[PDB]
C-alpha cells in the first residue's frame, strides 16, 4: 500500500517549512540553490508517493502525543479506581 495522503501532505508541509528556513539564512546563490532544493523536494515527493507500506494504521503525526497524555491520565484514573476497588 502506498503512503497515506495525510502523511504525504504533512511531510510536504515540513519540507516546505525547512526549505523556507534554509533559504532564510542563504544570502547569495539564491536562485540556483532554490531550484536545486525544489528539484530535491519534488524527487522526494515522488519517492514517498511511490513508497509501499504494509497495511498498518498510523495516525496523524501532530496529535498522537496529546493522545498519549490523555491516555496516561486515563490509566492513572483507572489505577486510582482500581486501588479504591481493591481497598473496598
Amino acid at each position: 500500500q502506498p503512503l497515506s495522503k495525510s502523511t504525504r501532505d504533512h511531510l510536504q508541509t515540513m519540507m516546505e517549512s525547512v526549505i523556507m528556513t534554509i533559504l532564510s539564512n542563504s544570502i547569495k546563490e539564491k536562485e540556483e540553490i532554490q531550484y536545486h532544493l525544489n528539484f530535491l523536494k519534488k524527487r522526494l515527493l515522488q519517492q514517498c508517493e511511490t513508497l509501499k507500506v504494509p497495511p498498518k494504521k498510523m495516525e496523524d503525526l501532530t496529535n498522537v502525543s496529546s493522545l498519549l497524555n490523555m491516555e496516561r491520565a486515563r490509566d492513572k484514573a483507572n489505577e486510582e479506581g482500581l486501588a479504591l476497588l481493591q481497598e473496598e
Binding site: 486515563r74 484514573a77 483507572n78 479506581g81 479504591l84 473496598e88
Partner: protein, 297 residues
C-alpha cells in the same frame, strides 16, 4: 454545557408540541414569564430554539434535564417494557433511602447519573444513566426504576439493564433494607395494568333456540372466571412447555400476542372456539400473577 443542551433538545423533540406547555407546568424549572415569552402556535424549530435560549439564560444542569425526562416518561409511560422485582425479609425515610442508594451506585464503579422524582401513591421514579470507569455516563441509553415505599415490589424498564442486572438489584435491596431479592418471570408494556395486577387493585319468540343450556352454562362459567370488571390490559404472553406426547416428551413453545388480552380470551368461550371451562394455564393470569409459564410432564 452543550451536552445537557442537546439532551434537553432531544427530549423536547420527543415531547409532542401539543402538550409542551403541560411539560413546563410539570417541569417548573423555568419561570412562568419565560414561558409567556414563547408562543406555541409558531414553528417547532422556533419553539425549541426559544426553549434553548430560555434554559441557557438560566443555568442548565443534568438534574433538571433528568427531571424533565422523568416527567416525559410519566406522561407517556407506554414506550418501554416493564419487569417486576420482589423483595423479601419496617422503618422508612426518603432522605436516608436516597442517600444510601446514591452512595451504593457511586460505589458501583465510580459514578452514575442518578435522578429521583417523588410521584403520587408513593411512586418514587428513578432515572439511571450508566457510565463506565473511563467515560461519562451516557444519556442516550437510560433506564427507569419505580419504587413504592414499604412495599415488597419494584418496577424496572429493561432496555440495557442486561449489561449489569445484579448491581441494580443488590443496590435496591440494600437501600430497601431487604435481604432477599428475586425476579419473577412477568414482563409487559402497560405499566398501569401491571400496577393493578401486582397489588390486586383491579324477543322474537318464534325462534326456539336449542342447546340453550349449553349457552347459559358457558356464559355463566366465562363470567365467573373473568368477571364484569374490565380486565387488566395485558399485551403479551408466552408459555414454554415440555410434556409427554401420550397420543421423549414433546417440547412446545407458544406466544400469545394481542393488543387487548383477557378479552379475546374472554370471548373465546362465547364464540365457541374453546371449551366452556378454560384451562388453568389461561384462567390464572391475574390470579397467579404469572405471565410466562413452563410445563413438564
Amino acid at each position: 454545557d452543550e451536552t445537557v443542551a442537546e439532551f434537553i433538545k432531544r427530549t423536547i423533540l420527543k415531547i409532542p408540541m401539543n402538550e409542551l406547555t403541560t411539560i413546563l407546568k410539570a417541569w417548573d424549572f423555568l419561570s412562568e414569564n419565560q414561558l409567556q415569552t414563547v408562543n406555541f402556535r409558531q414553528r417547532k424549530e422556533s419553539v425549541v430554539q426559544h426553549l434553548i435560549h430560555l434554559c441557557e439564560e438560566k443555568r442548565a444542569s443534568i438534574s433538571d434535564a433528568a427531571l424533565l425526562d422523568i416527567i416525559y416518561m410519566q406522561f407517556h409511560q407506554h414506550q418501554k417494557v416493564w419487569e417486576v422485582f420482589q423483595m423479601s425479609k419496617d422503618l422508612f425515610d426518603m432522605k436516608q433511602f436516597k442517600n444510601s442508594f446514591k452512595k451504593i451506585l457511586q460505589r458501583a464503579l465510580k459514578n452514575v447519573t442518578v435522578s429521583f422524582r417523588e410521584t403520587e401513591e408513593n411512586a418514587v421514579w428513578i432515572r439511571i444513566a450508566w457510565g463506565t470507569q473511563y467515560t461519562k455516563p451516557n444519556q442516550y441509553k437510560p433506564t427507569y426504576v419505580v419504587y413504592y415505599s414499604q412495599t415488597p415490589y419494584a418496577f424496572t424498564s429493561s432496555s440495557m439493564l442486561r449489561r449489569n442486572t445484579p448491581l441494580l438489584g443488590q443496590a435496591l435491596t440494600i437501600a430497601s433494607k431487604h435481604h432477599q431479592i428475586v425476579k419473577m418471570d412477568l414482563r409487559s408494556r402497560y405499566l398501569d395494568s401491571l400496577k393493578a395486577i401486582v397489588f390486586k387493585q383491579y324477543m322474537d319468540s318464534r325462534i326456539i333456540h336449542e342447546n340453550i343450556v349449553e349457552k347459559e352454562r358457558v356464559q355463566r362459567i366465562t363470567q365467573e372466571t373473568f368477571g364484569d370488571y374490565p380486565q387488566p390490559q395485558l399485551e403479551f404472553a408466552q408459555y414454554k412447555l415440555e410434556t409427554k406426547f401420550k397420543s421423549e416428551p414433546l417440547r412446545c413453545l407458544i406466544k400469545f400476542s394481542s393488543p387487548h388480552l383477557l378479552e379475546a380470551l374472554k370471548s373465546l368461550a362465547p364464540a365457541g372456539i374453546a371449551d366452556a371451562p378454560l384451562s388453568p394455564l389461561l384462567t390464572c393470569i391475574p390470579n397467579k400473577r404469572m405471565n410466562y409459564f413452563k410445563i413438564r410432564d
